[PDB]
Each structure stands twice: as structure tokens, then as C-alpha cells.
Amino acid sequence: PEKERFIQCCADITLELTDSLTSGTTREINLNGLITKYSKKYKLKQQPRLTDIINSIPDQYKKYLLPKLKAKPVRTASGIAVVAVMCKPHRCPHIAYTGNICVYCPGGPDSDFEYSTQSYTGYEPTSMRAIRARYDPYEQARGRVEQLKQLGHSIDKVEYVLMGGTFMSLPKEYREDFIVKLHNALSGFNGNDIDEAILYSQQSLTKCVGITIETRPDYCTQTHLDDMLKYGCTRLEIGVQSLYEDVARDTNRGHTVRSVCETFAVSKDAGYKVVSHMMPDLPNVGMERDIEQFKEYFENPDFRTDGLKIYPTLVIRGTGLYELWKTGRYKSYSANALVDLVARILALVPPWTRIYRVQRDIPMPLVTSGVDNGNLRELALARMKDLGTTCRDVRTREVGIQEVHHKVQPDQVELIRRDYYANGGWETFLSYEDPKKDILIGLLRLRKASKKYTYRKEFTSQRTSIVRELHVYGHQGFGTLLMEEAERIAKEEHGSEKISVISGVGVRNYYGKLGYELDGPYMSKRI
Amino acid sequence: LDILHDYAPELFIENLEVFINQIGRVDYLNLFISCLSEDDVTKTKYKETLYSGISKSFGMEPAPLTEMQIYMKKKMFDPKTSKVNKICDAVLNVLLSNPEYKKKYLQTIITAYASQNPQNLSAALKLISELENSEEKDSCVTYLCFLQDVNVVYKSALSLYDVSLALLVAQKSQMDPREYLPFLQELQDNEPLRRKFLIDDYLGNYEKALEHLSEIDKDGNVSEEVIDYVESHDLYKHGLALYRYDSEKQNVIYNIYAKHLSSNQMYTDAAVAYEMLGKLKEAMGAYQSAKRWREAMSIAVQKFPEEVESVAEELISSLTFEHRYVDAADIQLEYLDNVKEAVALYCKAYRYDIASLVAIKAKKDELLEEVVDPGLGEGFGIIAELLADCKGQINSQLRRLRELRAKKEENPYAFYGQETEQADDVSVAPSETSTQESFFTRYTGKTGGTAKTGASRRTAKNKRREERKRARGKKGTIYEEEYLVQSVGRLIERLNQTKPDAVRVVEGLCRRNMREQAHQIQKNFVEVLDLLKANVKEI
RNA sequence: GGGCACAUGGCGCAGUUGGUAGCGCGCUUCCCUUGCAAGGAAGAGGUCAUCGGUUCGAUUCCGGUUGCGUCCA
Ligand SMILES: C[C@H]1O[C@@H](n2cnc3c(N)ncnc32)[C@H](O)[C@@H]1O
Ligand code: SF4
Secondary structure (H helix, E strand, O other): OOOHHHHHHHHHHHHHHHHHHHOOOOOOOOOHHHHHHHHOOOOOOOOOOHHHHHOOOOHHHHHHHHHHHOOOHHHHHOOEEEEEEEOOOOOOOHHHHHOOOOOOOOEOOOOOOOOOOOOEOOOOHHHHHHHHOOOOHHHHHHHHHHHHHHOOOOOOEEEEEEEOOOHHHOOHHHHHHHHHHHHHHHHOOOOOOHHHHHHHHHHOOOEEEEEEEEEOOOOOOHHHHHHHHHHOOOEEEEEOOOOOHHHHHHOOOOOOHHHHHHHHHHHHOOOOEEEEEEOOOOOOOHHHHHHHHHHHHOOOOOOOOOEEEEOOOOEEOOOOOHHHHOOOOOOOOOHHHHHHHHHHHHHOOOOOOEEEEOOOOOOHHHEEEOOOOOOHHHHHHHHHHHHOOOOOOOOOOEHHHHHHHHOOOOOOOEEEEEEEEEOOEEEEEEEEEEOOOOEEEEEEEEEEOOOOOOOOOOOOOOOEEEEEEEEEOOOOOHHHHHHHHHHHHHHHHOOOOEEEEEOOHHHOOHHHOOOOEEEOOEEEEEO | OOHHHHOOHHHHHHOHHHHHHHOOOHHHHHOOOOOOOOOOOOOOOOOOOOOOOOOOOOOOOOOOOOOHHHHHHHOOOOOOOOHHHHHHHHHHHHHHOOHHHHHHOHHHHHHHHHHOOOOOHHHHHHHHHHOOOOOHHHHHHHHHHHHOOHHHHHHHHHHOOOOHHHHHHHOOOOOOHHHHHHHHHHHHOOOHHHHHHHHHHHOOOHHHHHHHHHHHOOOOOOOOHHHHHHHHHOOHHHHHHHOOOOHHHHHHHHHHHHHHHHHHOOOHHHHHHHHHHOOHHHHHHHHHHOOOHHHHHHHHHHHOOOOHHHHHHHHHHHHHHHOOHHHHHHHHHHHHOOHHHHHHHHHHOOOOHHHHHHHHHOOOOHHHHHHHHHHHHHHHHHHHHHHHHHHHHHHHHHHHOOOOOOOOOOOOOOOOOOOOOOOOOOOOOOOOOOOOOOOOOOOOOOOOOOOOOOOOOOOOOOOOOOOOOOOOOOOOOOOOOOOOOOOOHHHHHHHHHHHHHHHHHHHHHHHOOOHHHHHHHHHHHHHHHHOOOOOOOOO
16 A cells, blocks of 8 residues: 555554663664665655654653653753744734834734734744634644654753733733643643642643743833733843834834833843843944944943844835835845844853844745845854854853754863843853853853842842842753852852742742742742 | 872872761762762873973863774773772772761762772672662662663672562663563572572573582482583583583583584594593594594404404595595505505605515515505606696796886885885785786776775785685785795795605615616706795895 | 566666766754744765676676566477
8 A cells, every 4th residue: 555554664663663672772774764675665655754753652662762862952851842822913002102013013913914913924833833723822832842742852841932912912811811821731730710820830740941921111010020920921022123212213113222221120120031132224223333232232231131132124015114115215234244244243242141043034035125044143153253253152152052063062161150230230140161162051140139120029128139040951960059159149249138039830849959938939048 | 079089099098088977968979989080180181280380381282082092992991900990999998897887878889889890780789688678778779770771780680699679670671561570470489599590591691500500409310401501502611610520420411512522523522522431433433533543443453343444444545535645554554454555655655665664574575666666756757747847837936026017116015025125114005906907096996985994015805895806915826926925935835845755755766776867856856946036036 | 487678875866897976855953843844054874686807997797696577388
């Protein structure tokens, strides 16, 4: 027949590999060749894959033999599987009180697309997954985690992302339902009450190690921050796009830069970690001001956020930019010019700031004018090497990508500690790194809760240092070392009586063995 | 970490007890007696620069130590000198001694036993089972399986002669319980010696299996399981290394070993082993298949006065096929009792003096005109024939070795060699196949496109499609010229074989009073051996 | 049953004595399933089905073996 011999070929491959691996012996010819020698007796197009054979192993043998094919730390060991979901399409808040929507957001509810949420084009993989789930969080989460399971990953720490427009502009009942649904699809609990859902997810297997909620500076007030900390949010993503007030004004942005900075301060003093969006090639900017703002961003001790997202301005049909690009009022950059600009910007990224992404993955056939290729960071790093300078980004110095791309191993770990001042607070940045090769092995941020901006009833009662983020990628007793040094710092360097770590609800038990007791939404510990 | 020893090893080793007392947590001690790498960090690298001069090169880039090195370092490693073993043994001495340390710091001792390169897991599992508990012992087994591979530790548990520990470990090995539970049950419900035999079988320890199966029965009648086992595995050496006590059973092993040796390859072993068992006809067969005429025929004449000459016929056939005309003549004259045939073999083996002896012995001087003079004439003929043939071969060899004639230069000139024409350096890809090939090498070839080892020292060959060229890079037939000596040896072997024969035959023929041709052929032989280009310029 | 064109990355192909490493899919990796796509980039998978003598050269020449169309008497 056509395909039956393929199924029985996979079956014999599975049984033979299990038998060989029980006593500790490897294969010889990368089973696909052995697969064909039996299944392609007539050569009827039977093409297996690694996922195909993985979905054949029996459960008892699957759960024990699967990770013996993957070894990248963040891939299967650290296992922070970024599982992105989307909310129902809706119109972003500012449109009401200004008159029109942001002038560069493609898609939405009233664009040429009837189906994609705001700032989305309904062609990214996430959009098709959302629509094939009809924007329901339960199906989204279950399907994504199941697809990840099928592809042979041993995922154990799901990290949620809530993409799409401003999620914070929805009726409170709807958001409560969304978050409860996410946690339920993770843990398996089938309840409806946010408190119970959190309490169940905390014990859950497949821990919800956090959740990110991209939002707007205005919709991040005290009450909104309390809401998102109730949900379990751990990292915020804030739209900025410009430090020049004129650009924000001309883009129908609807929020002043001063508002952005105030929101940064109060959120970082609420224990969050903020990742900001920074659009180059905004109208009326030019290369000189582009470089100026990106050089000030890390120089002004007011923004200095921990993450970043460089999103070069892409014009797409239907936006407010098509009725301005067609008239020729605005012309984009040049390919070489923009690659060089990205190179110079990345040259200035301090070691603590992590570059989470570069230019959007909106498809080439749809963009009217902007970035040509889709591998901008590749060319940026090549041009960086050409110029001589090098990148200090966390993502460009973490162990995991090095072991598979650079194929360089770490052997000179040493303790390094930065100590800067951002958003009115004193932020320490501990790390275990490789000074000779500039490889970051583990990191931990830390902040002295500033009197001016802190507001949480847990923090204003007594002096407090917040462990805003702890991350270990590639014996291996590092989290312990970093946590101990942070304790020492908060006891002597900071003079704080109670040190508390914000944590995703999934990982709240890990700090339990460290002696932390659960206070509100934080894992705290007195000193 | 390891530093703490490599810096002041003498003082450290002195105060290891103080150090252990200092380190409070068991965890630190544990994970310090595991990361002991056999490399130093104070005299091979990370030099203390406090005392070095400020103008010295502080440090160069350490080399990557290309993979191949590790191959002849792990096999060159000496497990008696390594620092790891020394510190492990010191720790073991300071820990096993005090009862309190054994009570508490057990996991340290387990780590030490599993860390030393000889991997003393036997002592580790022994001490683990020796604990009188069911809570800590299982914890330590789990710790060991996390540390050391579960399969090897389970095999060591078997080798420790315990099943309960083996079953406890086998719950961490992921093997199907159907594949070991019946095994462990069968091991459990048997006698100590049967269980030990089965244990030593499963690990493959055949010698232990036999040396523990032999002791199951104290009877003088040997078992048949033992002989079946040794026959299946061919370990009779341990059979005779174990039963040096019981003569009768040792003779049983002699019998089975003799059968084995007679079957597989070799024969005098079978005869000398049958010497104890007697095995008359088989002993005779082994002796005569060994071409040992005298011993077999002595056994015949001392045992069988009926087949004395038939074995003599077999031996004379062997010696005629062996072309050993000396013992052939001996057994012909003494046993076959034929002086004429004995002298014929004497002439065949280029012997005349004893041939004259034998002709005199039968009071027969006619034999000279019958065989001896014809035999000497044939000897003269064959020496003349070999003279001419070897002279022609020498001419051909010299003609090939006329001169360098350039041609091949890419090979180091030891490839030429040939009476030290020129020295050489290293070696290049083996070229110049049969009879002066060229080395255009425009392309890589049909069997080409890869690297070439560069092995033209003097000569070489490759297995790529199995040679298929008669010139297997060797100095023989259709030789490729260019041979550093070893072509003289092709002639030296023959002339040294014939030279005692040459002088013997010429002296014997001189004794017969035809010394003209004798001295003629002697002088011709000395001339042809002299004029040979022996090595370089006859030096 | 023997002659017999052919038998060559998993697959259909360029295997060539003036003269042997790759085409199309297929698989693995990263960019990226908007941290891991079944696109694009970049690689791993082989010196012919064995051997004998000569050529810068050898299942590549000749010789026979196991199948793939095929007989023939
Ligand atoms: C999702 C992030 O991308 C920004 N953004 C909005 N429109 C575009 C576009 N056309 N291309 C790239 N990024 C865009 C949003 O303003 C936010 O900063
Ligand atoms: S600019 Fe901000 S608020 Fe406006 S559509 Fe884009 S994401 Fe929504």
C-alpha cells in the first residue's frame, strides 16, 4: 500500500530503538535511512520526520527517551516555552479621545482585515492559531502546548504572552475570564474564580513561570498594576516608539513621554520588569535623531529599561501611513542605511539590557516599504564585526544560542555586578559571566524600592529590596549563589529588612525551599 | 575549588582532618570529592605572578589540545600516580577510621569510591548494604544512581553477590521489570554456589563462573556441566590452573584440551596431553601428524609390534612430502631397512659422507656407481643450473637498478634508497606503482578526492578497492625497482642456503676423485657471489 | 535454468579510464511556529555489488555473483 508500511516502519523503528536504548546503546545510521530500507520497498513518497517517529514512542518509554535528543538549555532544559496567545479583536483606547487610531498600526478591527486584532495582519502563525481557535484562550493554550509536546519538547515551564492591541482596555469580567482560562488550560483545574485558579496553578505541573501583558503607559495606573499583579503578570511591555514629543504628537499616539517615564518608574517600583518598544524610522525623525534617541535612551537614567524591542517602521496598506506614504510626504530609509543604523544602535546596548527582538515578522509580500529581508539582526551583527565593535546584549551573550550557533563552551565563569540608577531607583544587576569570551551564564536583577514611587502595602510598611528577575540558562548551583549574594546585598548594601521576589505563579514553590513565605502576590522573606 | 589541595598539597594532606571538621555541610564535602580533575592549576597554568618578574611574559594562550592527544592520554594514564586517587585514599583513611564520620559522612565515602578512576564501586555498594537501615540506604542508592550510571552500578551490585540490593537498584534502571524480576527470583531461590555461578555468568565473568561451579560438588567424580561450559567457552587454561590438586579430574581436563587442540590447530600439544591418558592410537596419530617420527615409532615398537612398519610408511611419506630427506633416510635405513633408498635420500638432502657410511655398512661399494656417483653428478647439474639462473636474475636486478634515472623524486629518496643513493625526509603520498609510474595528479582520481596520509617513506600500499595492483608496495616479483637493500636479501637468502651445500657437495665430489669439475663449479660459485653488487659498491 | 542493458545519498538522477561529488525533492540546524514553521538561508547523509593486471587512472577495462524488463527450445 501507500502509507500503512510507513506506520509499521515507524513501529518497528520505535520498538528496536527502545530495545537498543534499554541497555545503553546508540543507533548507527540515523534511523531515516534504516526507515527507508524497509518502508520504501516501492518508494511511494513515504517521508518520515523526527516529530513523526517521536509521536510513536509508548508513554512509559516516551517520557524517558524524548529529552535524549535535545540538549540546548533554553530549548528543553530551561524550558521557558514562549506560548503566545491573543485576545479578541478590539479598538485600542486612544481612538476615542483623539479622533483616529495610531498612524502606523496595520490591521485591526476596521482595516482591510476583518479578523486580526489591532496591530496585527492576520498572517503571523499566532494569528492563524488564534482564528482556528476563534480567539478563545482555552483552545489557544491547549493547542499551543500540545503542539509543543508533539514536537518532542519536554516543556515544563510555560511562559505566557498576551499579544494583540491593548489587552488592558477590556471589561474586567472579560479579562478575569481570560486569565482564569489560561491558568486552567495550563493546570487542568476547571474553575472560574481567579483566586482559586491561582492557588491551583501554583501547585500545578507545567508551571506558569510568568505572563507578559503588552499595554499602554496610560492604562498602567496603580489600580491597573494591582489588577495585573492579581492575574500573575511578571513582565510588562510598554509602547514608547519615540522620546521626542513631537513624533508622538504627530503619530496620534495619545500619551506624552513624561507619562511613559512616570509609568516606567511606578511599574518598576511595583516589582515588575518592563520591556519597551522603540520604533526607528518614525516620520520626521531622520537618521541623526534616530541615533540621538537611541543613544539617550540608555544615557538618560530615567528610562534605562531592562528589555527592548527595536521595530523599524513598516508601512502597510490601509494604515494611516499609506495615506501619507502614497503622497510621498514620507520616504523610508535605505536597506544599507538601516542595517548600519541597527549596527550602531546595538553597539550601545549596555550589558544588562536584553534585546528581545528586532524588526517585526510581518510578511514581506504585504509590506509596502520598509525592511527588505527578514534576517535584519544577521546583517546587523555582520556589519558590527565589519566595524570592529561588538554587541553586549544579553540575548547575544547568553549560553544557549552559543552552544548551537557559535558552538563555544564556557570555562571561565566569574562574578560580575553592575549597579546603576534607573527610574529613580538604585538597580543592581548581578551575573555570573565569562570575562574572556563575554558569555553570560546567570543573571539576577535587584532594586531598592524608592520612597518616592513605591506604593504597595507590602513595601511601604518597611524598607524592601525587590528581586525583580532571576534567570539561569546554562555543577549548576547558580540560582543559589545569586540569591545568597542578593540576600547579602539587601542586608548590608541596601539596608532592607524584608526582601521580596515577584514571581510567576508557577514558580512560587521554588522560592519555598529558599525560605520565602508568600505575602500577597510576592514571595517575601524578612531579614 | 580543587585549588585548595593543589596549592599547598603537603600542608593540606597534613590537615585534611582539620579541613573536614571545618567544612560543616555534607553537601560541600560531597561535591568537593567529585570535581577532582586530574589536572593541576598551579604548575601547569594559572601561575602565581606575585614572585615572577614584572617584565616576564605573564601568560600565553593555552592550546586547544587537539582531540587525538586525549586518545593516548587516557590509555597512557597511570591510575597509581594521579592526584585524584591520592586525595581519595587520604579521605578514605580519615573517614573510615572514626565511627562518627562513617555514621554521618557516608555520602562522602560513596563519592570518593565512585570518583577514583579505578572506580571502587565494590567497596561503595558493600558499605551501603552494610548499613543496618532501610531509609538512609535507599537514599544513598538513589544518590549513587544519580551520580554513577545505573547500569554499571547494577552490574556491580550483582558482582557484590546480593540480590536484594540488586532489586533495589534495578528499580532505577528503567529496564522492563519482566526482564529482570524473573532473573532476580531465580537467583534468590538457589544455593549460594549456584547463585554465584549464575551471577558470574550474567556479567560474563566466565573464569569466576567455572571456579565457583567446580566447588559445588566435593566428589572426586568431576561434573559434566563444567566440561560443557569449558568446551563452549574454551577456557581449559583455568581448568588446569584450578585442578592442579585433583589428578584424575586434571587428566579429564587434559583429555578435553587435547581434543580441542587436535581439532583446532596444533598437534604436539595433543600428543603430549595424551601422554597422561595413554590414548594409544590418538597419541600415535598426533605424533605422526606432528612429523615427530622417533617418539611415535618408539611408542609403536614398545606397544604395538604389529604396526611398526605401517607408521614407518606414513612417516616416510610425510618426510618425502616434507622434503626432509635426512630423517627420511634415517627411518629408511633403520626401520624400512633399505640402504639404497636411504642413500638416495642422502643424495637428495645433499649428503654424501653418511651416504658413503651407509654404502659401506651394507658391504656394497656398487652403490657409488648406482646412486652416489649419479647423485653427485645431479648435484653438479643442479648447482650449475642455479648458478646460471641466479646469474641471470642478478643481471636483471642490476639492469633495473642501473642508475637513478631521476623519474621519481617526489617520494623522499629513501623510497629510492637502493644502496644509499640519497637520504630522505618524512614521507609523501605513496606513488610510483609497478615499474616506474608517473605522478601527473592533474585530477584526484576515481578513488580520490580525500586527503593522503603522505606515506612514501620507502614503500606503502592502500586498501582502497583492495590494492588490485600486483606491486603491493613490496620488494618481490615485478618489483618497482628503488629498494633500499632487501633485494640483495632476495639473493642473500639463496646463496647462504646453498653455500654450506655448495662446499659440502664440492668436497664430497672431490672425495670421489673428479675434483676438476668440483673446483670449476666452486670457483664459478665464488666468482658469481663476489661479482654481485652486495649492498652499496660491495661494502 | 544461461546469454543479457541496468543496478550507485531515502528516492528518481550526473559513475566519466581526455575524465568522479553532485541536480531535483527528502532530513537536520538558525533565523525563528512572532525564541525553535513542514518558506529562506546552512549543512549531514557516498568513491559502485566483490575481486584479479596494466594505466598520472580501476564494481568504472575485461571476467563472473544477487535482483531488476526480457527471452529461448
Ligand atoms: C507591537 C509594537 O509594534 C509597534 N508597531 C505599530 N505599527 C507597526 C508597524 N507597522 N511595524 C512595526 N511595528 C509597529 C506598536 O506600536 C508596538 O510598539
Ligand atoms: S499605537 Fe498602541 S494603542 Fe494605538 S493601535 Fe498601536 S498598540 Fe494600539
